[PDB]
């Protein structure tokens, strides 16, 4: 509806109470977490950033 504050022309949430992970219809239309922001989090968030750009033995 255009007379609401959070107006976006696409349906952001479907009106279904209890749309969980156990239903296989949700599983088919869900986005897999491949090459997402989690893939950036797994390879970049290191306690030492120099251990992600080279090896320490190779640099030394």
């Amino acid at each position: 509806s255009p007379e609401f504050k959070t107006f976006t022309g696409y349906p952001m949430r479907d009106m279904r109470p209890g749309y969980g992970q156990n239903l296989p219809d949700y599983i088919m239309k869900k986005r897999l977490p491949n090459n997402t922001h989690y893939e950036l989090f797994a390879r970049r968030d290191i306690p030492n950033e120099d251990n992600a750009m080279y090896g320490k033995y190779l640099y030394d």
Partner: protein
């Protein structure tokens, strides 16, 4: 290589399911029961909520 949803994986779903029955014998898969098949051994499984 497909990316994103499972709807874009046509061959990989086909390659999985043929491989699923390929390694699995039916002598193994018969022992898995559902919930209502286990509940039938109760003195009363079924009553209305």
């Amino acid at each position: 290589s497909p990316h994103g949803y499972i709807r874009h994986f046509e061959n990989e779903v086909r390659d999985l399911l043929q491989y699923v029955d390929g390694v699995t014998p039916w002598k193994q898969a018969q022992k898995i029961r559902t919930y209502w098949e286990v509940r039938s051994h109760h003195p009363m499984p079924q009553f209305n909520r």
